[PDB]
Short mmCIF file of C-alpha atoms and ligand atoms in Angstrom, two decimals:
data_model
loop_
_atom_site.label_atom_id
_atom_site.label_comp_id
_atom_site.label_asym_id
_atom_site.label_seq_id
_atom_site.Cartn_x
_atom_site.Cartn_y
_atom_site.Cartn_z
CA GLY A 26 97.76 67.05 96.71
CA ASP A 27 99.14 69.43 96.67
CA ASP A 28 95.50 71.71 96.25
CA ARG A 29 95.04 70.65 99.29
CA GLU A 30 97.60 72.30 100.18
CA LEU A 31 97.19 75.33 99.25
CA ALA A 32 93.57 74.70 100.21
CA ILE A 33 94.28 74.59 103.81
CA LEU A 34 96.65 78.42 103.33
CA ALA A 35 93.08 79.22 101.89
CA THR A 36 91.85 79.12 104.31
CA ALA A 37 94.24 80.04 106.88
CA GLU A 38 94.19 83.09 105.47
CA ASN A 39 90.19 83.49 105.14
CA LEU A 40 89.90 83.43 108.21
CA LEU A 41 92.97 85.64 109.47
CA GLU A 42 90.86 88.43 108.68
CA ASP A 43 88.28 87.83 110.65
CA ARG A 44 90.09 86.92 114.16
CA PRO A 45 93.92 86.06 115.16
CA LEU A 46 94.82 82.58 114.71
CA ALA A 47 94.56 81.36 118.59
CA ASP A 48 91.21 81.92 118.23
CA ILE A 49 91.76 79.42 115.09
CA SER A 50 91.98 75.38 115.14
CA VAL A 51 93.63 72.73 113.50
CA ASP A 52 89.15 71.86 112.85
CA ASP A 53 88.59 74.83 110.94
CA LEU A 54 92.01 74.51 108.74
CA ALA A 55 90.73 70.98 108.47
CA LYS A 56 86.84 72.05 107.56
CA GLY A 57 87.41 75.32 105.59
CA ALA A 58 89.73 73.32 103.58
CA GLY A 59 87.43 69.75 103.53
CA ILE A 60 89.88 67.06 104.91
CA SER A 61 89.94 66.05 107.73
CA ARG A 62 92.84 66.73 111.14
CA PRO A 63 94.97 63.85 110.76
CA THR A 64 94.93 64.53 106.41
CA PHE A 65 95.86 68.40 107.37
CA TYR A 66 98.76 66.58 109.49
CA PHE A 67 100.20 65.28 106.56
CA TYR A 68 100.61 68.15 105.06
CA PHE A 69 101.47 70.07 107.98
CA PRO A 70 102.77 70.10 111.96
CA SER A 71 100.70 72.32 113.08
CA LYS A 72 98.79 75.98 112.32
CA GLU A 73 101.44 77.98 113.62
CA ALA A 74 103.32 75.93 110.57
CA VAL A 75 101.33 77.35 108.24
CA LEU A 76 100.96 80.52 109.20
CA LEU A 77 105.15 80.51 108.29
CA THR A 78 104.21 79.26 104.81
CA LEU A 79 101.79 81.90 104.33
CA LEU A 80 104.68 85.39 104.88
CA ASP A 81 107.16 83.05 103.84
CA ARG A 82 105.05 83.19 99.94
CA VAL A 83 104.38 86.69 101.14
CA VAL A 84 108.00 87.97 101.97
CA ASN A 85 109.58 86.41 98.09
CA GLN A 86 106.51 87.59 96.57
CA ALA A 87 107.82 91.34 97.27
CA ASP A 88 111.37 89.96 97.63
CA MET A 89 111.34 88.51 93.67
CA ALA A 90 109.04 91.98 93.17
CA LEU A 91 112.13 94.25 94.58
CA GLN A 92 114.57 91.94 92.17
CA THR A 93 112.78 92.71 89.51
CA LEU A 94 112.42 96.45 89.28
CA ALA A 95 116.75 95.65 90.35
CA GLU A 96 117.15 94.62 87.20
CA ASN A 97 114.20 96.77 84.90
CA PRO A 98 115.46 99.82 86.26
CA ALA A 99 112.69 103.09 85.36
CA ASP A 100 113.71 106.15 83.93
CA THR A 101 112.04 108.92 86.35
CA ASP A 102 114.17 110.92 88.88
CA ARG A 103 115.43 109.89 91.76
CA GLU A 104 112.21 110.06 94.15
CA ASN A 105 110.75 108.05 91.88
CA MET A 106 113.02 105.32 92.39
CA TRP A 107 112.65 105.69 95.96
CA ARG A 108 109.26 105.73 96.07
CA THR A 109 108.46 102.89 93.47
CA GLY A 110 111.09 100.50 95.55
CA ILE A 111 108.67 101.27 98.32
CA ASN A 112 105.84 100.40 96.27
CA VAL A 113 106.72 97.31 96.31
CA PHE A 114 106.91 96.72 99.85
CA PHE A 115 103.11 98.80 100.71
CA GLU A 116 101.15 96.76 96.98
CA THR A 117 102.89 92.81 98.28
CA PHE A 118 102.16 93.40 102.18
CA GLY A 119 99.39 95.17 102.16
CA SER A 120 97.18 92.66 99.86
CA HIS A 121 97.62 90.28 102.64
CA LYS A 122 96.90 92.93 105.55
CA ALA A 123 96.11 89.88 107.23
CA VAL A 124 98.98 87.45 106.91
CA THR A 125 101.07 90.73 107.74
CA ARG A 126 99.32 91.38 110.62
CA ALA A 127 99.60 87.20 112.18
CA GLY A 128 102.80 87.15 111.20
CA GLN A 129 103.48 90.61 112.79
CA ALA A 130 102.24 89.26 115.27
CA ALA A 131 104.49 85.81 115.41
CA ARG A 132 107.33 86.66 116.12
CA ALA A 133 107.89 87.31 119.65
CA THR A 134 106.49 83.58 119.98
CA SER A 135 107.92 81.86 116.85
CA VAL A 136 111.71 81.85 116.46
CA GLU A 137 110.77 80.13 113.27
CA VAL A 138 109.38 83.44 111.54
CA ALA A 139 111.43 85.36 113.03
CA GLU A 140 114.31 84.34 111.55
CA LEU A 141 112.14 84.47 108.11
CA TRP A 142 111.80 87.95 108.92
CA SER A 143 115.08 88.70 110.11
CA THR A 144 117.26 87.16 106.83
CA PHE A 145 114.64 89.18 105.02
CA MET A 146 115.63 92.21 106.14
CA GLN A 147 118.47 91.68 105.85
CA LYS A 148 118.81 91.62 102.43
CA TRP A 149 116.52 94.41 101.57
CA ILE A 150 118.66 96.41 104.00
CA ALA A 151 121.90 95.49 101.85
CA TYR A 152 120.01 96.15 98.97
CA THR A 153 118.54 99.69 100.50
CA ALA A 154 122.47 100.80 101.47
CA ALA A 155 124.73 99.26 98.48
CA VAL A 156 121.68 101.97 96.31
CA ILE A 157 123.34 104.51 98.54
CA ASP A 158 126.38 103.27 98.26
CA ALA A 159 125.66 103.40 94.50
CA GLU A 160 124.29 107.62 94.06
CA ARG A 161 127.49 108.39 96.46
CA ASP A 162 130.16 107.41 94.76
CA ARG A 163 127.66 108.92 90.98
CA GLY A 164 128.33 112.69 93.72
CA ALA A 165 124.40 112.56 94.27
CA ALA A 166 124.15 111.70 97.78
CA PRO A 167 126.52 113.30 100.43
CA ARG A 168 128.50 111.36 102.54
CA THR A 169 126.12 111.51 105.23
CA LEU A 170 125.93 108.81 107.56
CA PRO A 171 126.93 105.37 107.31
CA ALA A 172 124.86 104.16 104.31
CA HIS A 173 124.12 100.59 105.88
CA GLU A 174 123.55 102.84 109.15
CA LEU A 175 120.91 104.56 107.58
CA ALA A 176 119.34 102.50 105.33
CA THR A 177 118.55 99.97 108.25
CA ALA A 178 116.31 102.64 110.72
CA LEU A 179 114.77 103.20 107.41
CA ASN A 180 114.03 100.49 106.21
CA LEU A 181 112.55 99.60 110.28
CA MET A 182 110.63 102.65 110.16
CA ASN A 183 108.80 101.38 106.75
CA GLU A 184 108.25 98.05 108.38
CA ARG A 185 106.83 99.54 112.24
CA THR A 186 104.66 102.58 109.92
CA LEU A 187 103.55 100.42 106.94
CA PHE A 188 102.25 97.78 109.49
CA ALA A 189 100.73 100.63 111.68
CA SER A 190 99.00 101.61 109.30
CA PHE A 191 97.07 98.52 107.70
CA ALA A 192 96.61 97.18 111.10
CA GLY A 193 94.66 100.90 112.13
CA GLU A 194 96.77 101.80 114.73
CA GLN A 195 96.37 104.91 117.25
CA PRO A 196 98.34 106.73 115.80
CA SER A 197 99.03 105.97 112.67
CA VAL A 198 99.26 107.53 109.21
CA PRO A 199 96.66 107.29 107.41
CA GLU A 200 97.53 104.21 103.86
CA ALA A 201 96.17 106.67 101.56
CA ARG A 202 99.29 109.12 102.91
CA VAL A 203 102.04 107.05 103.98
CA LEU A 204 103.18 106.40 100.59
CA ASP A 205 104.31 110.18 100.74
CA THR A 206 105.26 110.11 104.50
CA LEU A 207 107.87 107.95 103.85
CA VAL A 208 109.10 108.50 99.87
CA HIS A 209 109.94 112.72 101.60
CA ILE A 210 111.56 110.35 104.84
CA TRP A 211 113.52 108.40 102.44
CA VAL A 212 114.48 111.16 99.86
CA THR A 213 115.36 114.07 102.53
CA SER A 214 117.69 112.12 104.65
CA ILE A 215 119.29 109.95 101.49
CA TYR A 216 120.43 113.23 99.45
CA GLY A 217 120.15 115.63 102.68
CA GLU A 218 122.20 118.16 104.30
CA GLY B 26 103.08 98.08 152.39
CA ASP B 27 104.12 99.68 149.31
CA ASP B 28 107.24 98.64 150.88
CA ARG B 29 106.46 95.02 150.07
CA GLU B 30 104.63 96.08 146.34
CA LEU B 31 107.94 98.07 145.28
CA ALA B 32 109.97 94.65 147.07
CA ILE B 33 107.35 92.76 144.42
CA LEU B 34 108.36 95.34 140.86
CA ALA B 35 112.07 95.48 141.83
CA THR B 36 111.48 91.53 142.38
CA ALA B 37 109.96 91.33 138.69
CA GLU B 38 112.63 94.38 137.08
CA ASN B 39 115.13 92.02 138.23
CA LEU B 40 113.89 89.15 136.72
CA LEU B 41 112.76 90.28 133.30
CA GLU B 42 116.34 90.92 132.54
CA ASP B 43 117.37 87.19 132.66
CA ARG B 44 113.72 85.27 131.40
CA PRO B 45 111.03 86.81 129.81
CA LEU B 46 107.16 86.45 131.32
CA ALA B 47 105.57 83.55 129.98
CA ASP B 48 108.62 81.62 132.18
CA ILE B 49 108.06 83.61 135.73
CA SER B 50 105.03 82.54 137.87
CA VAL B 51 103.49 84.38 140.79
CA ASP B 52 105.89 82.48 143.32
CA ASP B 53 108.60 82.98 141.61
CA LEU B 54 107.83 87.12 142.64
CA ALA B 55 106.18 86.86 145.84
CA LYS B 56 109.68 84.51 146.72
CA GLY B 57 112.46 87.37 145.36
CA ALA B 58 109.21 89.65 147.07
CA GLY B 59 109.85 87.86 150.56
CA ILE B 60 105.98 87.45 150.07
CA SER B 61 103.82 84.76 150.50
CA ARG B 62 101.29 83.75 146.80
CA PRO B 63 99.12 84.95 148.30
CA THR B 64 100.36 88.72 149.59
CA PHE B 65 101.45 89.30 146.20
CA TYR B 66 96.95 89.07 145.38
CA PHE B 67 96.60 92.02 148.27
CA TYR B 68 98.73 94.08 145.62
CA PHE B 69 98.95 92.92 141.78
CA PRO B 70 96.05 89.93 140.75
CA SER B 71 98.18 88.82 138.15
CA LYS B 72 102.02 88.59 136.88
CA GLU B 73 101.01 90.68 134.07
CA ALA B 74 99.75 93.06 136.13
CA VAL B 75 102.76 93.97 137.59
CA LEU B 76 104.46 94.26 134.44
CA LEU B 77 101.77 97.25 133.33
CA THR B 78 102.31 99.30 136.23
CA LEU B 79 106.20 98.90 135.62
CA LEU B 80 105.76 100.04 131.80
CA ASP B 81 103.18 102.64 133.49
CA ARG B 82 107.00 103.85 135.95
CA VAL B 83 109.33 103.91 132.56
CA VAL B 84 107.02 105.85 130.07
CA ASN B 85 105.96 108.87 133.32
CA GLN B 86 109.19 108.83 133.77
CA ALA B 87 110.21 109.75 129.92
CA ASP B 88 106.91 111.90 129.67
CA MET B 89 107.75 113.86 132.60
CA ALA B 90 111.07 113.82 132.07
CA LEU B 91 110.58 115.13 127.27
CA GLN B 92 107.32 118.03 129.53
CA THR B 93 110.96 118.81 132.18
CA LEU B 94 112.56 120.21 128.81
CA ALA B 95 109.83 121.33 126.74
CA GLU B 96 109.64 124.56 130.18
CA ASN B 97 113.39 124.65 129.56
CA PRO B 98 115.28 124.80 125.84
CA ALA B 99 118.43 124.44 126.15
CA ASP B 100 119.91 127.04 124.22
CA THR B 101 121.23 125.52 120.70
CA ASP B 102 121.01 125.02 117.22
CA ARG B 103 117.64 123.31 116.62
CA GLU B 104 119.69 119.50 115.56
CA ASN B 105 120.39 119.75 119.83
CA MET B 106 117.22 121.13 120.89
CA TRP B 107 116.03 117.60 118.36
CA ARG B 108 119.20 115.16 119.65
CA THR B 109 118.30 116.44 123.54
CA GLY B 110 114.54 115.27 122.85
CA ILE B 111 115.58 112.12 120.77
CA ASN B 112 117.96 111.58 124.35
CA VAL B 113 115.45 111.35 126.44
CA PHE B 114 113.58 108.19 125.84
CA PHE B 115 117.66 106.52 124.34
CA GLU B 116 117.52 106.66 128.20
CA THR B 117 115.51 106.53 129.64
CA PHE B 118 114.02 103.55 127.88
CA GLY B 119 117.76 102.18 127.87
CA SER B 120 117.93 101.98 131.59
CA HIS B 121 114.54 100.18 131.69
CA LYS B 122 115.21 97.76 128.47
CA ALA B 123 113.88 94.43 129.92
CA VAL B 124 111.07 96.10 130.60
CA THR B 125 110.80 98.20 127.97
CA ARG B 126 110.95 94.55 125.78
CA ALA B 127 108.61 92.48 127.85
CA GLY B 128 105.72 95.38 127.64
CA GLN B 129 106.89 95.84 123.81
CA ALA B 130 106.48 92.08 124.13
CA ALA B 131 103.09 93.06 125.80
CA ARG B 132 100.77 94.44 123.57
CA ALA B 133 99.91 91.56 121.18
CA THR B 134 98.58 89.58 123.97
CA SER B 135 97.48 93.26 126.48
CA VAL B 136 94.91 95.19 125.55
CA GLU B 137 95.72 97.70 128.88
CA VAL B 138 99.07 97.60 128.15
CA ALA B 139 97.90 98.03 124.24
CA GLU B 140 95.62 101.14 125.62
CA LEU B 141 98.82 102.65 128.13
CA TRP B 142 101.81 102.93 124.81
CA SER B 143 99.10 103.90 122.69
CA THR B 144 98.23 106.99 124.67
CA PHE B 145 101.17 108.21 125.81
CA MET B 146 102.37 107.50 121.95
CA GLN B 147 99.41 110.12 120.73
CA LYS B 148 100.60 112.15 123.01
CA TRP B 149 104.86 112.30 122.47
CA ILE B 150 103.84 112.92 118.74
CA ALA B 151 101.00 115.64 118.60
CA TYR B 152 103.88 117.64 120.94
CA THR B 153 106.85 116.52 117.88
CA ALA B 154 103.52 118.12 115.46
CA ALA B 155 103.15 121.10 117.27
CA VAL B 156 107.47 121.87 117.78
CA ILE B 157 107.03 121.78 114.03
CA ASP B 158 103.95 123.55 112.82
CA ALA B 159 106.34 126.06 115.51
CA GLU B 160 109.35 125.20 113.70
CA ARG B 161 106.93 126.05 109.95
CA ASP B 162 105.54 129.36 111.72
CA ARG B 163 108.79 131.03 111.99
CA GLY B 164 110.87 130.20 108.94
CA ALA B 165 112.87 127.84 109.56
CA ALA B 166 111.36 125.05 108.60
CA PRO B 167 109.38 124.59 105.28
CA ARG B 168 105.50 123.44 104.48
CA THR B 169 106.36 119.87 103.38
CA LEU B 170 104.28 116.47 104.77
CA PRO B 171 101.19 117.37 107.10
CA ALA B 172 103.59 118.33 110.37
CA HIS B 173 101.28 115.30 112.70
CA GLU B 174 102.41 112.74 109.91
CA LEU B 175 105.68 113.44 109.90
CA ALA B 176 105.62 113.25 113.59
CA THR B 177 104.27 109.75 113.27
CA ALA B 178 106.51 108.69 111.20
CA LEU B 179 109.34 109.49 112.12
CA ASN B 180 107.75 108.56 115.77
CA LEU B 181 107.18 105.58 114.82
CA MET B 182 110.69 105.35 113.36
CA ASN B 183 111.86 105.82 116.85
CA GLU B 184 110.34 102.95 118.49
CA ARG B 185 110.87 100.47 116.35
CA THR B 186 114.72 101.71 115.86
CA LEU B 187 115.11 102.25 119.89
CA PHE B 188 113.94 99.36 120.66
CA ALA B 189 116.15 96.79 117.85
CA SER B 190 118.67 98.23 119.02
CA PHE B 191 118.06 97.08 122.67
CA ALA B 192 117.50 93.98 121.44
CA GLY B 193 120.51 93.53 119.76
CA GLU B 194 118.45 91.84 116.90
CA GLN B 195 119.72 91.00 113.49
CA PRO B 196 119.14 93.75 112.14
CA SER B 197 119.86 96.65 114.06
CA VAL B 198 121.38 99.38 114.52
CA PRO B 199 124.53 99.46 117.44
CA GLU B 200 123.30 100.83 120.55
CA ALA B 201 126.24 103.38 119.76
CA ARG B 202 125.51 104.34 117.11
CA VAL B 203 121.61 105.08 117.23
CA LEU B 204 120.96 108.51 118.32
CA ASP B 205 123.41 110.22 115.80
CA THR B 206 120.64 107.38 113.54
CA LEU B 207 118.31 109.00 114.02
CA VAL B 208 119.09 112.57 114.64
CA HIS B 209 119.65 113.31 111.24
CA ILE B 210 116.67 111.40 109.24
CA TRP B 211 115.18 113.40 112.48
CA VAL B 212 116.18 117.12 111.38
CA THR B 213 117.22 116.60 107.53
CA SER B 214 113.61 115.45 107.20
CA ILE B 215 112.41 118.79 109.07
CA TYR B 216 114.21 121.36 107.03
CA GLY B 217 115.18 119.98 104.05
CA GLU B 218 113.65 120.60 101.04
O1 Q2N C 301 111.38 99.34 102.70
C1 Q2N C 301 111.85 98.26 102.95
C2 Q2N C 301 111.75 96.65 103.69
C3 Q2N C 301 110.67 96.59 104.32
C4 Q2N C 301 109.17 97.53 102.99
C5 Q2N C 301 108.48 96.96 104.33
C6 Q2N C 301 108.07 95.82 105.52
F1 Q2N C 301 107.22 96.21 106.17
C7 Q2N C 301 109.03 95.27 105.59
C8 Q2N C 301 110.30 95.50 105.17
N1 Q2N C 301 113.11 97.87 101.65
C9 Q2N C 301 112.39 98.65 100.07
N2 Q2N C 301 113.64 99.07 99.50
C10 Q2N C 301 113.68 100.80 98.75
C11 Q2N C 301 114.53 100.60 98.00
C12 Q2N C 301 116.11 100.38 97.69
C13 Q2N C 301 116.50 100.61 96.95
C14 Q2N C 301 116.01 100.76 95.69
C15 Q2N C 301 115.30 100.81 94.85
N3 Q2N C 301 114.12 100.87 96.58
C16 Q2N C 301 112.37 101.61 98.91
S1 Q2N C 301 111.28 100.46 100.09
O1 Q2N C 302 110.35 110.10 119.87
C1 Q2N C 302 110.04 109.72 120.59
C2 Q2N C 302 108.66 109.62 120.52
C3 Q2N C 302 109.19 107.90 120.77
C4 Q2N C 302 110.44 107.35 120.96
C5 Q2N C 302 110.89 106.58 122.17
C6 Q2N C 302 110.09 105.18 122.72
F1 Q2N C 302 110.65 104.38 122.65
C7 Q2N C 302 108.56 105.83 121.74
C8 Q2N C 302 108.41 106.46 121.71
N1 Q2N C 302 109.47 111.96 120.85
C9 Q2N C 302 110.21 112.01 120.54
N2 Q2N C 302 110.27 114.19 120.90
C10 Q2N C 302 111.47 115.53 120.36
C11 Q2N C 302 110.61 115.75 120.41
C12 Q2N C 302 110.05 116.71 120.50
C13 Q2N C 302 109.98 118.08 120.12
C14 Q2N C 302 110.82 119.24 120.61
C15 Q2N C 302 112.36 117.89 120.80
N3 Q2N C 302 111.84 116.07 121.51
C16 Q2N C 302 111.97 113.83 120.08
S1 Q2N C 302 112.01 112.37 119.78
#
């Protein structure tokens, strides 16, 4: 039953690694999942709903990993704290590059995908800002920019930079360098001046 | 003659301020430009070619303004130097928000638009890196990250952040705050540690 749903999702993630969603048909998803096309439409109204489901799984995986980190701080310096947090997104989305790239593109076309991404970005930015505010309250970071505006720009940088690296866009930071690059910019802008 | 081309371009820029390119027809562009549909196809093969032309004008305007700045340095501190450069893009693209937003979306669909954007981003990143390298050579900036990788991430941040602000996305930095926000992150990451 729901097994067939997971088969549809797995087939979609596999096919997205080699072609965009526009080049994938409902019949391709049904055929790969071992079901008929009418049976597919029982589980999903469209191939776009399949992508939205895949993206929802990935963003919730990242959100849950960040929540785990937040509840069990690693005893390290400040640079390591930020690196471990940025790494949650590097590893989670980097493990699902086809879904990430496809979900990014679908933001222009799908209001559901745009709303899903916006909801989680607001959550992650609020958490970033709250940690920056905590660092300021304890005297470790200077009161420079409004924390929420700083957090917004830094999170948007990570979105654009990580996704460019994963897609091998030109220009991009090589994926083997992108964590160090982002961590440097976060740490200097949060603690600097 | 070429006057009718400029009328097509002006009509397209005006219509894009109120609806996306998918909701604009070749007939809408012809009607607004005072020409017939066959006459339009003399000047442009498609409405997508009109957008590519509009975007080419905007990116070359920004590139030429940056070249002007590079040849006449303003006598100021380092923070003002970076602010004046970032402002070139804030003002140029912020004066053509509909074209910017439409060109951003067309990157997913149009290889010509993606290549145009990539060509100019590589140019602007190379210039950023060369200035960072100059600052390091004169002892003003520390040798931290590879300059070209730092320049890449900072330019990608500006792309994503400026365009989110112009479109009023949620989340975004308010447009009245985005220049200060970006300048802070550039200056601390270039001169910090
Ligand atoms: O970077 C993002 C958001 C993102 C990344 C990649 C995307 F593709 C889309 C969104 N969120 C982050 N939060 C932290 C953080 C905050 C507080 C304490 C520790 N770590 C580090 S990175
Ligand atoms: O920020 C960008 C690229 C960009 C911005 C907005 C976009 F929408 C798309 C690309 N380029 C910049 N170069 C400088 C600079 C470099 C050296 C000296 C002085 N200024 C400042 S900002």
